[PDB]
Design a binder for these strands. Structure first.
Ligand SMILES: [Mg+2]
Ligand SMILES: [Mg+2]
Ligand SMILES: [Mg+2]
Ligand SMILES: [Mg+2]
Ligand SMILES: [Mg+2]
Ligand SMILES: [Mg+2]
Ligand SMILES: [Mg+2]
Ligand SMILES: [Mg+2]
Ligand SMILES: [Mg+2]
Ligand SMILES: [Mg+2]
Ligand SMILES: [Mg+2]
Ligand SMILES: [Mg+2]
Ligand SMILES: [Mg+2]
Ligand SMILES: [Mg+2]
Ligand SMILES: [Mg+2]
Ligand SMILES: [Mg+2]
Ligand SMILES: [Mg+2]
Ligand SMILES: [Mg+2]
Ligand SMILES: [Mg+2]
Ligand SMILES: [Mg+2]
Ligand SMILES: [Mg+2]
Ligand SMILES: [Mg+2]
Lengths: 200, 63, 67, 60, 145, 141, 80, 55, 143, 70
RNA sequence: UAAUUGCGAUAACGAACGAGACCUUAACCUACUAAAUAGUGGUGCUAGCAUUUGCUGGUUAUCCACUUCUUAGAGGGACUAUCGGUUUCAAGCCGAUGGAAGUUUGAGGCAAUAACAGGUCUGUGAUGCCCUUAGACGUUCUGGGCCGCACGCGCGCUACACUGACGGAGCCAGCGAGUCUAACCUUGGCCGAGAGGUCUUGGUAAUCUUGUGAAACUCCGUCGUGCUGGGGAUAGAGCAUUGUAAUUAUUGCUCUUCAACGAGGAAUUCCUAGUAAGCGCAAGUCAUCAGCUUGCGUUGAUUACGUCCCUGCCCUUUGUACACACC
C-alpha cells in the first residue's frame, strides 16, 4: 500500500486507513446499500466519512438535511432531553461503540445493518385529524421518524437499567434490521400504520 | 404484500385545516402513464418517490 | 424577500432615461459609472441602484419595458 | 467600550425593557525623537477641544 | 484488584454497635448505616485500623472490626484531628467528642432541651416545631408537620 | 531563511495560526505531536487532510501550530482548516499551479469547513429572556 | 484663581438652535401671549431664520382641568 | 415574655394545622375601580368659553 | 531518535511517572494524607489512598515544566472543579492551597523544581534531566 | 444488595464454562444472567483475558466488548 | 413584499413624513498605513533528550527583519451576482454555481400621525391644589419591622440518576472591571484540612491581577440497580470572614443528621441555526449577601421553512339613533 514515513510517528493503522478504499475508522463504507427503492437518494452514504462529526449547516435550506451523512443525522438524535443537549462527543463515542457491538454478533457490516434498521421503521402510511384520514408520509419524514422512534426507544430502555445506552441501541437496531416483533420501533411503526386502515 | 411505487411529478398544495398535509399527483413507474392523486404528511419536493399499499383509493380535499 | 424600494427603481429608471449610450449590461461598470455621474450617498445604496439599472438594461435588449 | 444597562421607565411598571448606553474611548500613544525647545510648541495649537493631550518623558 | 475466592470466610449478616450491617455491600460504605457516621469518618478510620477497603463488608477479620470500634470510641487518643468530629467543645466540659449511633439521637435532644430550658429564641422555635435558621416560612415548608 | 509560509483557521472564536517550513515533514500543534490530541474520537477530523490528498505529501515541509481562544472542539476544527490553506499557499508560492489546483479540488470535494471559513457566530441575547431567542415564561394571570 | 475664565460669545442664527427658541416660547407665554399666537410666531420665525423645518408642541393644562397637547410644524422634517 | 411564648398554648404549627383556612385566602383582585375609568367622577366640567380662552 | 515530554500521551505518561516516584523512596509526604479531599469544592478524598500524591506529583511537574513559571494559586485554580452547593447552582472554586504548596516543596527538596524569579517556581535543571528519559521508558511501552 | 454481589464459590465454576458460546461480553452481559454484581463483575473480565478466553475488540472504560477465543 | 415594498390595473399625475435609506455590532481582505502596552521568523546568550545537522523550552529588549496571526485607521467588497426554473413571462419568487457572506447578510439602534383618565407626586430643589408644621406627617437618635406563618397563586434553583454520581487525570473561551488623597483589582513566598490568615509585589491598566488553566465536556478508575454512593431539604456541634452591630442564625469551611422526590392530573410557556437546550463566566446590585437581572463565550440538536383549525390583531364591506364615540 506504498507506505510513506516522516519524522513524527504516524501509526501503521493510520497508514492503512487512507485513500485505499474508504471505511469508517474500522468499518467499510462501500457495499452498504439501501434494500428498499424508497428512501434511496435520502440515505446519504458513499460520501464516506471516517467519524460522524461534521460542522455542516444542514438547515439554512430545507432539503439539504437529506445530503447529510445518515449515521451522523442518526447521531444528532442522541444529544436530546437537555441532559444531553450538546454532549456531541459523548454521543460520537456511544455510536463508535454501538457499531463495535452490532458487528459483535451480526457479521454484516454495521454501516449496513443501520440502513436495515431504518428500512423497517418507516411508516408507509399514517393518519391525521380530519374521525381520522389515511395519509402516506413523505420519504424523508420516513427517515426522520425512523431515527426518532429508534433512538427514543433505545433511550427508553437504557433508563433505570444497568445495560448501557450503546447496548440497548445496538440490540434495538439489530431487531430493526428486519423487524423481529421486539424493537419499540417495529411495534410503534406497525401500529402507526395499522390505523391508517381505520379510515378507508 | 402487494405494494406500489409512485413518483410525484407536480405539487398541488397545502390541504387540511392546519395546513400540514399536501395534495400531490403521483406516477407509478410500473405501468406508467397512469393518474393517481395521494396526500402526504411529511414535507415533500418535486420528483420524490413514495409507496402505496392500497393502489385503488384516492381521498380529496380534507376538512 | 428583497423587493427594491422605489427610490432605487425611480433613480434607475431616470437613468436608463438619459444614459443608454453608457451603462453597459455588467454591474461593475455601472457602479463605477454612477460614482462619477450621480450624487449617491452610500455605497450599498448605489450598489442597489446600479444592480437594478443593470437588470433593466439587460432585459430592454430583449424587448420593451414600462417607463 | 463603556456600557450602562438600565431600565427605561423611571418606575417599575410595564414591560421590563432595558437600554444599553455606550461611551467609546480612544487613547493613542507615540514615542518621539525631538529637541528641548519644541517641548512646548506642540502644546500650542495642536489642541482640539475634546482631546486629552498628555506628554512626559521617562524610561524608568 | 485481582480475582479472589473466600471458602466460607464472609458472613452476610453482621450486627455490631447495636446497628445492623449488610454483608453484600462494601465495607467502607457498609459502615455508614450507623448514626453519627460519615462516608469520610469511616473512610479514614478504616485504614487507620489497617483494613483494605477494596472488598466487601463480611470477609473482614473479627479482630479487625473490634480494633475499628476502639478507634471510633477513642478517636483522639489514636491521632484523629479535632476538627473532624461533630462534638468539639461540646457545651460543658470543653471536650472534643464524637456522637455515635444511639447516643446522637440523645445528644440532639440534650442540646434541644437545653435551648428550651434556657428560653433561647431558637429553642422556642424548635418547641413550636418551626425552622430555626431564619428561613422565610411564608411560602415554604407547608405540608409535613 | 528558507521557503515557508504562514496561514490560519478560524472556527467560532478559535484561531489557529500555522507556519510551514521547508523541512523533514514533522508536525505538532502547541509543541506536541499529532499522534494524540484527545478529543480522541474527534482526532480523525484532523487526521483527514493527510489521507484525503494522499498522505506522503510532506517529505519537504514542516508543520506546527498554536491555538488561542476557542474550546476543546473549536480549536480542533480550526486547526485542520489552518493546515489545509497552509499546504495550498505553499504550493501557491513554491510549487506549480496544476498540483495546487489538484489539491484545492480534492479538498473542495470533501471539505467540511476545510477551506470554507465558517461564518456562523454567536447571536446576542436580548432582554426578555436568558437566551438568544428564548423568552422568560409568561403567566397570563 | 486664573485656572479658568469664561468669555461670552454671541450666538449666530439663534433661530436654528432649539433651546434658544424654546426658552423664547417660555418667556413669552409667561408674559401673557395667546398660546397659538406665540407658538405660531416662533415657528414662522424659525422658518424665516433658514431652518428647513420646524415643530413645537405644548402639553399640559391652560385654564382647563384636563390637559391638552397641540403641535405646530412647518416645512420638512425627518424622524428616522 | 419568652417564658410566656413557650408556656402559652395556642402557638405552634400543630395548633394551626388543626384549624381551617379562611376562604379569603383564595380570593382575587376584586377589580376595584377599573370599569369606571372613562367616566370622570369630579362631577365637574370645563367651560368651552374657558378652554377657548386658554388654548 | 530523541524523546520529549510533548511526545508522550498525558494519561499514560503521568501514570508512569507516578509508578516511578512511587517505587523510588524519597517522598517527603507531609504525613497528613488520610483525609483531605484536595479542595473544599469536592466531596470526598481521592480513592488511591496509598499514594496519589505521586499522581499529583506527576501532574505537578509535567505542568510546571511545560510552563515557564507557576504559583500555588494557579495550581489550586487548575485542579479545582465544580462544587455542588447542595440545592444552589454549581460553581467553580479553587483547590487546596497547602496540599499544593507542599506537594511542590516536598519534591523541590528532591530537586525537580526551582523557585523561579519574577515570583513562581520554574522547572528544575536536574529535573530538566528527570525529564524525557521517563518518556523514553513510556515509549518503551510501545517499543 | 441482592444475588451474590460477592464471590459465590460454586459460581466460579459457572463463569468458566459459561464464557464460550458468547458473541458479546460486558459487565452488563454478566449481571444479565442472574449473577455477580457489577463491582465484582467488571473486575473479572481482564482476569479471564489473562489466558486466551477473549479477544478485546473494545478499547476504553464505561463500555467493554470482548469476543470468543479464537 | 417584512413593509401604502413594489408589479400591474387605473381620473389621476407626479412628491414628502413613517418603511426603506441611515447608524451600530458580528462576519471578508497575505492589498495601504505599522506598533517592547500585539505578535511572528532569524540570531545572539542559554536548558534537556538524542545525537548526524534534529526535537522541546528559557531569556522586560542582546540584536536583525516582517505585519499572517492581534489591534484600529483609510479604502474595498454584495448589488440577491451568473445561469437556469416559475410567473400577466411584470414586481417578484425558487433551484444550482460562484462566493467572507445570498433568511431586511445575522443581530440590534432609530422610528411618523393619533390614541390610554395606562404607570410614575416613593427619582428629581419638576409641579397645581389639599393636609400637617413644634406633643410635626419636618428632622435626627435608640430598638423592632418590611423575613413575621393553618393556606392560595407566579418567576425561579437543585433533583428523581448508569448519555450518572463519584475519584483522579486530560484541560479550552469570550463580554467586563479595577486604589488619591487611598484602602480597588491582586500575582507570588510561607502558615492552615478547609475556610482562611500572614509577608511582599505589579497595576490609574491591551503594560499588573489574567492564558481569568471557568463549567459543562475528554480520558482512567471505583460503584451496580437496590432511594443506591442518586438526592441534599431539615437539623446539631465547631472553625472563619464582612461589618459599630450577625440573636430571627449576612456569607464561607468541617463534621455529623440523610426528608420529599422513582418523570409529574387538568392545564399552560419559549423557541427555526451556531438558534433550542445544557454549561459556566463578567458586569449591575455590593461592607457582607444571586437561587435575580444585563451581556459573554463554551458544547451544540430534533423538527418546520407550512397553514388559518385554535387564538390575537389588523383590512375592507356593512349597520348604527353612538361622536363624552358601547365604560
Ligand atoms: Mg447538572
Ligand atoms: Mg450517616
Ligand atoms: Mg425617511
Ligand atoms: Mg478546570
Ligand atoms: Mg479536575
Ligand atoms: Mg447540586
Ligand atoms: Mg493584518
Ligand atoms: Mg455554494
Ligand atoms: Mg387610573
Ligand atoms: Mg415623577
Ligand atoms: Mg414630592
Ligand atoms: Mg419585600
Ligand atoms: Mg417574570
Ligand atoms: Mg467527573
Ligand atoms: Mg489546623
Ligand atoms: Mg506601587
Ligand atoms: Mg440513600
Ligand atoms: Mg451527593
Ligand atoms: Mg418529561
Ligand atoms: Mg457579584
Ligand atoms: Mg433584583
Ligand atoms: Mg356610515
Amino acid at each position: 500500500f506504498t507506505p510513506v514515513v516522516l519524522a513524527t510517528p504516524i501509526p501503521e493503522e493510520v497508514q492503512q486507513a487512507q485513500t485505499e478504499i474508504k471505511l469508517f475508522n474500522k468499518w467499510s463504507f462501500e457495499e452498504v446499500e439501501v434494500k428498499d427503492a424508497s428512501l434511496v437518494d435520502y440515505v446519504q452514504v458513499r460520501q464516506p466519512i471516517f467519524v460522524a462529526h461534521t460542522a455542516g449547516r444542514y438547515a439554512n435550506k430545507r432539503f439539504r438535511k437529506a445530503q447529510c451523512p445518515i449515521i451522523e443525522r442518526l447521531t444528532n438524535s442522541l444529544m436530546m432531553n437537555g441532559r444531553n443537549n450538546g454532549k456531541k462527543l459523548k454521543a460520537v463515542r456511544i455510536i463508535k461503540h454501538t457499531l463495535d457491538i452490532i458487528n459483535v454478533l451480526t457479521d454484516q457490516n454495521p454501516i449496513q445493518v443501520v440502513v436495515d434498521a431504518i428500512t423497517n421503521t418507516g411508516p408507509r402510511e399514517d393518519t391525521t385529524r380530519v374521525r381520522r384520514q389515511a395519509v402516506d408520509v413523505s420519504p424523508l419524514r420516513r427517515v426522520n421518524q425512523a431515527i426518532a422512534l429508534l433512538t427514543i426507544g433505545a433511550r427508553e430502555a437504557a433508563f433505570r437499567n444497568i445495560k448501557t445506552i450503546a447496548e440497548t441501541l445496538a440490540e434495538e437496531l439489530i431487531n430493526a434490521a428486519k423487524g423481529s416483533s421486539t424493537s419499540y420501533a417495529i411495534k410503534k411503526k406497525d401500529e402507526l400504520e395499522r390505523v391508517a386502515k381505520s379510515n378507508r | 404484500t402487494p405494494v406500489t411505487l409512485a413518483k410525484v411529478i407536480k405539487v398541488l398544495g397545502r390541504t387540511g385545516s392546519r395546513g400540514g398535509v399536501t395534495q400531490v399527483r403521483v406516477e407509478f413507474l410500473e405501468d406508467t402513464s397512469r393518474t393517481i392523486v395521494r396526500n402526504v404528511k411529511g414535507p415533500v419536493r418535486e420528483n420524490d418517490i413514495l409507496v402505496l399499499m392500497e393502489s385503488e383509493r384516492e381521498a380529496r380535499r380534507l376538512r | 424577500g428583497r423587493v427594491r424600494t422605489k427610490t432605487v427603481k425611480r433613480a434607475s429608471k431616470a437613468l436608463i432615461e438619459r444614459y443608454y449610450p453608457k451603462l453597459t449590461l455588467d454591474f461593475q461598470t455601472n457602479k463605477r459609472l454612477c460614482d462619477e455621474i450621480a450624487t449617491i450617498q452610500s455605497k450599498r445604496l448605489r450598489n442597489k441602484i446600479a444592480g437594478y439599472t443593470t437588470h433593466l438594461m439587460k432585459r430592454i435588449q430583449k424587448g420593451p419595458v414600462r417607463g | 467600550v463603556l456600557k450602562i444597562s438600565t431600565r427605561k421607565t423611571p418606575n417599575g411598571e410595564g414591560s421590563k425593557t432595558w437600554e444599553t448606553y455606550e461611551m467609546r474611548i480612544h487613547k493613542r500613544y507615540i514615542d518621539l525623537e525631538a529637541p528641548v525647545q519644541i517641548v512646548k510648541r506642540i502644546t500650542q495649537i495642536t489642541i482640539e477641544p475634546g482631546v486629552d493631550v498628555e506628554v512626559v518623558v521617562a524610561s524608568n | 484488584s485481582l480475582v479472589v475466592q473466600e471458602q466460607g470466610s464472609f458472613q452476610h449478616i453482621l450486627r455490631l454497635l447495636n446497628t445492623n450491617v449488610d454483608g453484600n455491600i462494601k465495607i467502607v460504605y457498609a459502615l455508614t448505616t450507623i448514626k453519627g457516621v460519615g462516608r469520610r469518618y469511616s473512610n479514614l478510620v478504616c485504614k487507620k485500623a489497617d483494613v483494605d477497603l477494596h472488598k466487601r463488608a463480611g470477609e473482614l477479620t473479627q479482630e479487625e472490626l473490634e480494633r475499628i470500634v476502639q478507634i471510633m470510641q477513642n478517636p483522639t487518643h489514636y491521632k484523629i484531628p479535632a476538627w473532624f468530629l461533630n462534638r468539639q467543645n461540646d457545651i460543658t466540659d470543653g471536650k472534643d467528642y464524637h456522637t455515635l449511633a444511639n447516643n446522637v439521637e440523645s445528644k440532639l435532644r440534650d442540646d434541644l432541651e437545653r435551648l428550651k430550658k434556657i428560653r433561647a429564641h431558637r429553642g422556642i422555635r424548635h418547641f413550636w416545631g418551626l425552622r430555626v435558621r431564619g428561613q422565610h416560612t411564608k411560602t415554604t415548608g407547608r405540608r409535613r408537620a | 531563511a528558507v521557503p515557508s509560509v504562514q496561514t490560519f483557521g478560524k472556527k467560532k472564536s478559535a484561531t489557529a495560526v500555522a507556519h510551514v517550513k521547508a523541512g523533514k515533514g514533522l508536525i505538532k500543534v502547541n509543541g506536541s505531536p499529532i499522534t494524540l490530541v484527545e478529543p480522541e474520537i474527534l482526532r480523525f477530523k484532523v487526521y483527514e487532510p493527510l489521507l484525503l490528498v494522499g498522505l506522503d505529501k510532506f517529505s519537504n515541509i514542516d508543520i506546527r501550530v498554536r491555538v488561542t481562544g476557542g474550546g476543546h472542539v473549536s480549536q480542533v476544527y480550526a486547526i485542520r482548516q489552518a493546515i489545509a490553506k497552509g499546504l495550498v499557499a505553499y504550493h501557491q508560492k513554491y510549487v506549480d499551479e496544476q498540483s495546487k489546483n489538484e489539491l484545492k479540488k480534492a479538498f473542495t470535494s470533501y471539505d467540511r469547513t476545510l477551506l470554507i471559513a465558517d461564518s456562523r457566530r454567536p447571536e446576542p441575547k436580548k432582554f426578555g429572556g436568558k437566551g438568544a431567542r428564548s423568552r422568560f415564561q409568561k403567566s397570563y394571570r | 484663581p486664573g485656572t479658568i475664565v469664561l468669555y461670552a460669545e454671541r450666538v449666530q442664527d439663534r433661530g436654528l438652535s432649539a433651546v434658544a427658541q424654546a426658552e423664547s416660547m417660555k418667556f413669552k407665554l409667561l408674559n401673557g401671549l395667546a398660546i397659538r399666537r406665540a407658538a405660531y410666531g416662533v415657528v414662522r420665525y424659525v422658518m424665516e431664520s433658514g431652518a428647513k423645518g420646524c415643530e413645537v408642541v405644548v402639553s399640559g393644562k391652560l385654564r382647563a382641568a384636563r390637559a391638552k397637547a397641540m403641535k405646530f410644524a412647518d416645512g420638512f422634517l425627518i424622524h428616522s | 415574655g419568652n417564658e410566656g411564648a413557650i408556656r402559652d398554648k395556642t402557638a405552634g404549627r400543630r395548633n394551626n394545622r388543626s384549624k381551617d383556612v379562611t376562604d379569603s385566602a383564595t380570593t382575587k383582585k376584586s377589580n376595584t375601580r377599573r370599569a369606571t375609568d372613562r367616566h370622570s367622577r369630579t362631577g365637574k366640567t370645563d367651560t368651552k368659553k374657558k378652554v377657548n380662552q386658554g388654548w | 531518535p530523541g524523546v520529549s515530554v510533548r511526545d508522550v500521551a498525558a494519561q499514560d505518561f503521568i501514570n508512569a511517572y507516578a509508578s516511578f516516584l512511587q517505587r523510588q523512596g524519597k517522598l517527603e509526604v507531609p504525613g497528613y494524607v488520610d483525609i483531605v479531599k484536595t479542595s473544599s469544592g469536592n466531596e470526598m478524598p481521592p480513592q488511591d489512598a496509598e499514594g496519589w500524591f505521586y499522581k499529583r506529583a506527576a501532574s505537578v511537574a509535567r505542568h510546571i515544566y511545560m510552563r515557564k513559571q507557576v504559583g500555588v494559586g494557579k495550581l489550586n485554580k487548575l485542579y479545582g472543579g465544580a462544587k455542588s452547593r447542595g440545592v444552589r447552582p454549581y460553581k467553580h472554586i479553587d483547590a487546596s492551597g497547602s496540599i499544593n504548596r507542599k506537594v511542590l516543596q516536598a519534591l523541590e527538596k528532591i530537586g525537580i523544581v526551582e523557585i523561579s524569579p519574577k515570583g513562581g517556581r520554574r522547572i528544575s535543571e536536574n529535573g530538566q534531566r528527570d525529564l524525557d528519559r521517563i518518556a523514553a521508558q513510556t515509549l518503551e511501552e510501545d517499543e | 444488595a441482592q444475588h451474590a454481589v460477592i464471590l459465590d464459590q460454586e459460581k466460579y465454576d459457572r463463569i468458566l464454562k459459561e464464557v464460550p458460546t458468547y458473541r458479546y461480553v460486558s459487565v452488563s452481559v454478566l449481571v444479565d444472567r442472574l449473577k455477580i454484581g457489577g463491582s465484582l463483575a467488571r473486575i473479572a473480565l481482564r482476569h479471564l483475558e489473562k489466558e486466551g478466553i477473549i479477544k478485546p475488540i473494545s478499547k476504553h472504560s464505561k463500555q467493554a466488548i470482548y469476543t470468543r477465543a479464537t
